[PDB]
Amino acid sequence: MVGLIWAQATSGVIGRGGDIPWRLPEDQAHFREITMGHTIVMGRRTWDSLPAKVRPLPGRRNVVLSRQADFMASGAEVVGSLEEALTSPETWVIGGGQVYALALPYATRCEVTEVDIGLPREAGDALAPVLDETWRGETGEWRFSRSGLRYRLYSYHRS
Numbered sequence: 001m002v003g004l005i006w007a008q009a010t011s012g013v014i015g016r017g018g019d020i021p022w023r024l025p026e027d028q029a030h031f032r033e034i035t036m037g038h039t040i041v042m043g044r045r046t047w048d049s050l051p052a053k054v055r056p057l058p059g060r061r062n063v064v065l066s067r068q069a070d071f072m073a074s075g076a077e078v079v080g081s082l083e084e085a086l087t088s089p090e091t092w093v094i095g096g097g098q099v100y101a102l103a104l105p106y107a108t109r110c111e112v113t114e115v116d117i118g119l120p121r122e123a124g125d126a127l128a129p130v131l132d133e134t135w136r137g138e139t140g141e142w143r144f145s146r147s148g149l150r151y152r153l154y155s156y157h158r159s
């Protein structure tokens with residue numbers, strides 16, 4: 001089972017300027033709950049974007065995709081291909097835009113947070129993959145974050 005997990009603005013934006021363009025602590029706790037105890041796979045940029053305090057993310061086997069054969073990330077397994085990254089039975093792909101797109105065909109679950117923030121797409125943003133009609137989804141109820149932003153959770157699956 002390969003799953004993808006991400007949070008997006010309604011527009012599809014997931015990243016800008018090498019970071020995530022909003023604050024939503026409740027969603028980050030959700031991320032931890034889903035991923036804890038599993039292998040997680042991410043692109044090198046997403047690894048770079050993790051706060052030092054949680055790089056690597058604790059309690060998870062951190063796998064990082066890079067085309068730099070020499071790249072080393074403390075506490076992570078650097079691999080050069082998606083094939084080498086997807087060897088664990090349950091794997092969560094945690095981004096970013098490039099790696100979500102790469103892994104989408106391999107995935108049978110998506111755990112998606114929609115963030116109700118006005119954030120029109122800009123050139124060079126990182127974007128969420130678009131889920132087509134092969135996916136079946138359940139839509140959760142809107143909640144307000146302590147940050148003031150409304151958000152909701154989707155669970156998608158395809159067999």
Ligand SMILES: NC(=O)C1=CN([C@@H]2O[C@H](COP(=O)(O)OP(=O)(O)OC[C@H]3O[C@@H](n4cnc5c(N)ncnc54)[C@H](OP(=O)(O)O)[C@@H]3O)[C@@H](O)[C@H]2O)C=CC1
Nearest residue numbers: 006007015018019043044045046066067095096097098099
């Ligand atoms: N809101 C959310 O849920 C999330 C948001 N983000 C945001 O996403 C953005 C980063 O996404 P993005 O810029 O797309 O970069 P990624 O995180 O997807 O990392 C891309 C890097 O992965 C490596 N890579 C890509 N394709 C391959 C391949 N086929 N084989 C081997 N290595 C490969 C390269 O590393 P190298 O260059 O070292 O070769 C490439 O530069 C940031 O802004 C981050 O904050 C990230 C995760 C979740």
Ligand SMILES: Nc1nc2ncc(CNc3ccc(C(=O)N[C@@H](CCC(=O)O)C(=O)O)c(O)c3)nc2c(=O)[nH]1
Nearest residue numbers: 005006007027028029031032050051054057094095113
């Ligand atoms: N839905 C959803 N998916 C994501 N998938 C990938 C990334 C990449 N960026 C991340 C991922 C995790 C953290 C992080 O600090 N996580 C900690 C703290 C958890 C907590 O605060 O309770 C942990 O998991 O232990 C981060 O600072 C950036 N983000 C999200 C995201 O924000 N939302």
